[PDB]
Design an enzyme around this catalytic site. Structure first.
Site, PDB file in Angstrom:
ATOM      1  CB  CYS A 101      -4.588  -2.181   1.809  1.00  0.00           C
ATOM      2  SG  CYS A 101      -5.594  -0.657   2.054  1.00  0.00           S
ATOM      3  CB  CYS A 104      -4.089   3.226   2.128  1.00  0.00           C
ATOM      4  SG  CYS A 104      -5.456   2.378   2.971  1.00  0.00           S
ATOM      5  CB  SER A 105      -0.719   0.365   3.955  1.00  0.00           C
ATOM      6  OG  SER A 105      -1.144   1.049   5.148  1.00  0.00           O
ATOM      7  CB  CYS A 106      -6.031  -1.642   5.385  1.00  0.00           C
ATOM      8  SG  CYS A 106      -6.293   0.134   5.063  1.00  0.00           S
TER       9      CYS A 106
HETATM   10 FE   LIG Z   1      -4.635   0.500   3.693  1.00  0.00          FE
END
Ligand SMILES: [Fe+3]
Ligand SMILES: [Cl-]
Ligand SMILES: [Cl-]
Ligand SMILES: [Cl-]
Ligand SMILES: [Cl-]
Ligand SMILES: [Mg+2]
Ligand SMILES: [Mg+2]
Ligand SMILES: [Mg+2]
Lengths: 197, 211
Positions: A101, A104-106
């Site tokens: 991601c 972000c960090s998905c």
């Molecule tokens: Fe994310």
């Protein structure tokens, strides 16, 4: 110039945010403790490993996982927050898939677990989209150049898991034996399942 | 928003801090670290105060140097606290009083967002599409490396979701759109300066146009 803003310790700030909300009755009894337990105990790459092992030993399930990942995951009861619309992507002799991601960090939390620090690092977010082969190599995974690397950037609601190739030397293994070699990093796509020598 | 969070393709970072299958330790490395996500869900699901998209955007709105030096889970502490203040639920005074010191927040939004686009196209698997050459100051789920670039559709989702550029600002006009897995050749995105094969970006219908 360019200096950090003054800040109270982060633990003090995080508990201040909890107390300010909780002290207004806005946080149900046991609510954050419930989530902590879900995040620690239920959302787990052992689940994605179970799905891979089933796909590896069950052609019909493999087909379902690759065509309707959501339905396949739902059979096991593993849909959940950040894991409601699932696509599994198949590695092949000429294709290695890897997930990030960049914004972000998905991550498919319920079946991969919450992302590890390294996946959320600026290093991984900046670099794996542009130089996945060098990134994977530095991380310990060599991808030969007869293989296309395909990076999935998790930018909307699809949540991905990699279905890695099944390594030689595992013929006839039980699902439990296969699960053991499908690690979190194999599900993210930066590692290939290893068979002991 | 063309913020520092849009990191894909940035050059100059060092090694990823991991080797495959290394011990990553417990889920939470400190006793507070479950709070940001748990309180995000209290705000989304229990209070109905904001969307997950608003959480992404409030973190994008951290002052840029603050974003760059702040560990991941702390950015969400800051982001959820900021939303609670902006929505009138908490005050910064009370947060700082309870914290015993400074609790700087994300910066105010400089965009009201935009609605779900009025005119879009239903695309099919195999179709060539270009990412619209548009600049959006508020929230958007298009990393800049693909703006204006051409790729091929590998999937159209069978569900639809609110347009981030609207719901990420708490607007009433996010509608719903499907998204598309758009496969780009690495060279389309980075010219010769890449060692990859392809990159698949999951793009809302409103970010795309026929090629
Ligand atoms: Fe994310
Ligand atoms: Cl295989
Ligand atoms: Cl703590
Ligand atoms: Cl070039
Ligand atoms: Cl269009
Ligand atoms: Mg046996
Ligand atoms: Mg940029
Ligand atoms: Mg002040």
């Amino acid at each position: 110039e360019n200096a950090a803003p003054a800040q109270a310790p982060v633990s003090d700030r995080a508990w201040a945010l909890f107390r300010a909300l909780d002290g207004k009755g806005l946080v149900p009894d046991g609510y954050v403790e419930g989530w902590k337990k879900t995040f620690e105990e239920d959302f787990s790459p052992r689940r994605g490993a179970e799905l891979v092992a089933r796909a590896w030993t069950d052609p019909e399930f493999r087909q379902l996982l690759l065509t309707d990942g959501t339905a396949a995951v739902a059979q096991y009861g593993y849909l959940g927050p950040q894991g409601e619309y699932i696509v599994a992507v198949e590695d092949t002799p000429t294709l290695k898939n890897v997930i990030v991601c960049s914004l972000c960090s998905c991550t498919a939390w319920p079946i991969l677990g919450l992302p590890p620090t390294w996946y959320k690092s600026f290093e991984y977010r900046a670099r794996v989209v542009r130089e996945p082969r060098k990134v994977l190599s530095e991380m310990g995974t060599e991808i030969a150049s007869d293989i296309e690397i395909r990076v999935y950037d998790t930018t909307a609601e699809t949540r991905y898991m990699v279905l890695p190739q099944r390594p030689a030397g595992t013929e006839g293994w039980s699902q439990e034996q296969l699960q053991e070699i499908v690690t979190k990093d194999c599900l993210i796509g930066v590692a290939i399942p290893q068979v002991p020598t | 928003m063309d913020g520092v969070h849009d990191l894909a393709g940035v050059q100059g970072f060092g090694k990823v801090p991991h080797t495959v299958n290394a011990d990553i330790g417990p889920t939470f490395h400190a006793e507070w670290e479950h709070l940001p996500y748990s309180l995000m869900f209290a705000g989304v699901a229990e209070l109905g105060a904001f969307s997950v998209d608003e959480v992404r955007y409030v973190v994008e709105r951290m002052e840029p140097r603050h974003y760059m030096m702040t560990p991941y889970y702390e950015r969400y502490v800051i982001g959820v606290a900021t939303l609670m203040v902006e929505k009138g639920i908490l005050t910064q005074d009370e947060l700082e009083s309870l914290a015993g010191g400074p609790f700087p927040l994300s910066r105010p939004s400089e965009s009201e967002g935009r609605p779900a686009p009025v005119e879009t196209t239903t695309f099919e698997v195999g179709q060539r599409v270009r990412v619209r050459d548009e600049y959006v100051p508020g929230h958007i789920r298009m990393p800049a490396y693909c703006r204006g670039r051409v790729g091929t559709i590998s999937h159209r989702t069978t569900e639809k979701w609110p347009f981030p550029d609207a719901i990420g600002h708490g607007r009433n006009d996010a509608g719903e759109e499907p998204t598309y897995h758009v496969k780009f050749a690495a060279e389309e995105l980075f010219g010769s300066d890449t060692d990859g094969g392809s990159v698949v970006v999951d793009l809302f219908e409103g970010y795309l146009e026929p090629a």
